[PDB]
Amino acid sequence: ENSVNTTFTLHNFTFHNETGANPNPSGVQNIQTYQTQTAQSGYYNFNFSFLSSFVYKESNFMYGSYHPSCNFRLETINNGLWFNSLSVSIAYGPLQGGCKQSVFSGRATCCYAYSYGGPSLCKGVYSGELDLNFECGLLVYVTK
């Protein structure tokens, strides 16, 4: 039950790949979330149309996702869960050090790392290794 005088209507949060901007410069604060949404009260669902030709990158020593501390995978949010505060956002950063740097010194509890066929001119973020060129797969954030 909500406060008073409510018809329980779930909100529909949508996403779409847009004509994005340039990949990021050298700073890990210099990656910009090119979407933002938030959860306030009641019910929600998340229309993810990002299974279309986007492979999932399995986590390992440096690159990939950092789904520890959030056991669910991104295509299983829509089942019955219980959160306390929720906000997801997409961001087009580098791939080898996106999540392993953007969880500790960053702004999310855990993040995922999808990939696609991207141009290999992407300035990665890490202490001392920020002078190379990497891939650019889209990485979603989730603040559980």
Binding site: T38, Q40, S87
Partner: protein, 96 residues
């Protein structure tokens, strides 16, 4: 009700207004009843996750991570109220 806000009720069994407010406008009106919140016991404002706590549970979260800058309570009479700041530790609670 006296004249001021559009609620029009002068009794108990009415509701409350936990509402956030930016510089010019208002949003997030939720109206919890005086039922389930019988008596004002405590009121916190926590740094991380920027969440605010009328006694016990949540009433409002948002995106940012912003520290408290001020607080204040109006009341005519009653018990002498207490202000206190705190740090973060681990604890465990027996509850039946």
């Amino acid at each position: 009700k006296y004249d001021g806000c559009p609620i029009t009720g002068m009794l108990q069994k009415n509701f409350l207004r936990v509402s956030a407010m930016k510089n010019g406008q208002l949003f997030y009106n939720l109206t919890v009843s005086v039922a389930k919140y019988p008596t004002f016991k405590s009121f916190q404002c926590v740094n991380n996750l920027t969440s605010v706590y009328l006694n016990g549970d949540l009433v409002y979260t948002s995106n940012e991570t912003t520290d408290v800058t001020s607080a204040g309570v109006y009341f005519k009479a009653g018990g002498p109220i207490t202000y206190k700041v705190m740090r973060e530790v681990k604890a465990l609670a027996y509850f039946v």
